[PDB]
Amino acid sequence: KDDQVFEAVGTTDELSSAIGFALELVTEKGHTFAEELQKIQCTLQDVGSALATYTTFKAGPILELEQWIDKYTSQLPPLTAFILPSGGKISSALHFCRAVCCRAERRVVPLVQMGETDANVAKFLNRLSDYLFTLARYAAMKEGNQEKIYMK
Amino acid sequence: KDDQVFEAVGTTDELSSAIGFALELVTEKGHTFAEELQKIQCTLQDVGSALATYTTFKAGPILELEQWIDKYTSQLPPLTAFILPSGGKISSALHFCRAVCCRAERRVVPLVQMGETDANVAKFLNRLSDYLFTLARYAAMKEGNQEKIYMK
Amino acid sequence: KDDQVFEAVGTTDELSSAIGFALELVTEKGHTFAEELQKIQCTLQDVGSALATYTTFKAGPILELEQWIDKYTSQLPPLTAFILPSGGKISSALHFCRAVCCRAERRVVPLVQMGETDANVAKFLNRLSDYLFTLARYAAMKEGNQEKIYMK
Ligand code: B12
Ligand code: B12
Ligand code: B12
Ligand SMILES: C[C@H]1O[C@@H](n2cnc3c(N)ncnc32)[C@H](O)[C@@H]1O
Ligand SMILES: C[C@H]1O[C@@H](n2cnc3c(N)ncnc32)[C@H](O)[C@@H]1O
Ligand SMILES: C[C@H]1O[C@@H](n2cnc3c(N)ncnc32)[C@H](O)[C@@H]1O
Ligand SMILES: [K+]
Ligand SMILES: [K+]
User: Fold this and answer.
1) What is the DSSP string of C67-105?
2) Which chains border B (3 or more CB–CB pairs < 8 Å)?
3) What distance in angstroms lies between residue B49's CA and the mean position of ligand 1's atoms?
4) Where is A73: in which H helix or E strand?
5) Could you tell me which of B14, C82, B127, B56 has the C-alpha nearest to residue A103?
6) Nearest CA-CA partner of B85 in B67, B107, B100
7) Three-state SS at C110
């Protein structure tokens, strides 16, 4: 069980660090959501502390992510298909963050199952992966980059 | 077995997203193989669908990768030694993609062993890791960056 | 046991490749520690060879990392708190490298436990994660970027 905790906190750290690099690309251009990614890094620090102690993890950050998801989704065109992860430098970095966030979620789920950590931790990471997907699309749109949809 | 499928599709996604970021660095310079990386992202979407359904996975993309590997290898100097992963921004990003692709292959192999997915999926990822290695060397060469070989 | 070796050598490779990309960002600016990261890539090649053969792994590189850690730590302000992984492009890329290095260490530890590889390999990766943390802080400081500390 302690192996699983080290894996979970390590991959949360890998996620926060990948977001840190994406944040650098954002502040360099004229994007205003850098502060949202920085706030997420603070919550990921609290996630790491919660995994390592089970402990309480409030649902406040989950509802905040849901609010941001709604805000960006309502500015995007309809989408009912997978997109190629691309869309510009910021968008592609956010899709990498998104995939790492899904990997962190996979490491947290067993801990939730064994009752070792709050289920809200896994739900936060689940919403974060949707936030990162939506934010990538938003950045690509704001940069005038076309959303690429493969079907065959 | 369902844990293994989520791990395999997640790491395929992580691979396609890392390639998306490398693709951004490519289109920014005067490199012409951006369309090859984009085609690979489409096949990786088909890989994800095949892992998630076992299902048929044609060998067409494998032979196409083998053709591209031959095309680039025949323009490179001889190499019988490990290189330091570097060679410029594009080349170093492709070596990271290459390592992630090997990790995706490690997640797919157990599914092939249990008969749960087509062996052609693992062979595609195996050839992709050779393609990404060769493409990194090619990008480094086209940029005039020296191939670094450590021996001691 | 052979699955574990492939996982360990693959994640060492992923680490060296991530360092290669960080190295590209370093040489682009006026930072002088590019040669230290390149030397680390050479040792990581030797780590891969040691994991794959158990085999001897000298402690020379460990003491060299400890010397470099001391050199940079003695130029930094005191820190008794977690920082948000950021600090500029180079610093944030090094924090990602740091997290990947911790993941490589997690893959090496079981091999050390089963007596299959030298414990010095795990200690090298442990010191490398401290080196990458310290180097990130140093790069951020040299760039005039403020160290971000979240508490709440
Ligand atoms: C396996 C799977 C994945 C895998 C592999 C996907 C792939 N490359 O094939 C991975 C982990 C990579 C993945 C990622 C995502 N997924 Co997914 N995935 C699935 C799944 C389970 C099967 C997909 C499949 O194999 N389809 C077979 C192929 C041949 O179908 P297709 O012709 O491409 O048609 C698909 C699309 O039209 C898709 N679709 C329909 N509406 C929408 C809307 C959006 C925004 C997207 C992206 C897709 C989508 O549904 C069809 C049927 O699968 C479906 C649920 C299901 N059982 O169908 C969810 C599903 C398509 N995924 C979903 C989501 C949310 C996503 C992500 C945005 C998650 C995230 N935050 O990272 C990403 C998007 C990735 C991208 N580049 O666009 C949703 C989409 C609807 C929605 N918005 O609620 C679904 C329907 C699951 C659900 N929530 O109910 N997914
Ligand atoms: C463990 C291993 C790895 C590990 C660790 C490697 C390391 N850092 O030590 C990892 C997973 C990182 C790795 C990666 C790769 N590997 Co490898 N690896 C091996 C292996 C199994 C042992 C290597 C070893 O420990 N040698 C001990 C050290 C001390 O030997 P050395 O003095 O450095 O001499 C080696 C090189 O000269 C090498 N070599 C000979 N010809 C060539 C050609 C090329 C292009 C390269 C890169 C190396 C190479 O062979 C010698 C003996 O190992 C060998 C097969 C074997 N049993 O020897 C394959 C081998 C060297 N790998 C091979 C390949 C293809 C690669 C990759 C290109 C795979 C990919 N697409 O990612 C990368 C290259 C990475 C890089 N930066 O250059 C091939 C090279 C020949 C070829 N082209 O067919 C081999 C021979 C396997 C095979 N296919 O038969 N590998
Ligand atoms: C779980 C854990 C992690 C997890 C999650 C951390 C998190 N986000 O909560 C992960 C794997 C991400 C992590 C990473 C690191 N960790 Co850690 N970690 C721990 C641990 C075991 C518990 C942390 C915790 O949950 N605290 C609960 C929260 C609420 O406490 P807090 O109010 O934030 O107060 C903490 C800080 O003040 C911290 N602290 C005190 N002095 C210093 C100095 C430094 C440089 C740092 C970064 C922190 C630090 O100690 C307090 C108590 O934990 C502690 C040891 C312990 N049992 O306390 C080590 C510890 C804090 N980690 C330590 C280190 C070295 C690090 C890394 C630099 C390792 C590396 N090279 O990557 C990184 C720093 C990451 C960053 N962004 O700053 C050291 C710090 C002291 C030192 N320099 O020796 C400790 C004390 C372990 C030890 N070596 O004895 N860590
Ligand atoms: C969109 C699809 O992605 C798969 N899915 C959901 N969460 C994860 C995760 N953390 N890692 C990988 N795959 C995941 C499910 O199959 C879902 O339906
Ligand atoms: C080049 C060497 O890399 C190792 N190898 C082959 N495929 C993978 C993979 N997916 N992940 C990690 N290591 C791998 C084998 O030992 C091979 O000989
Ligand atoms: C700083 C904290 O990080 C955790 N820790 C130590 N090494 C690793 C690793 N390789 N991967 C993940 N977490 C690790 C321990 O709990 C330590 O106290
Ligand atoms: K992993
Ligand atoms: K960049």
Assistant:
1) HHHHHHHTTS----S---S-SSHHHHHHHHHHHHHHHHH
2) A, C
3) 9
4) helix A60-73
5) B14
6) B100
7) helix
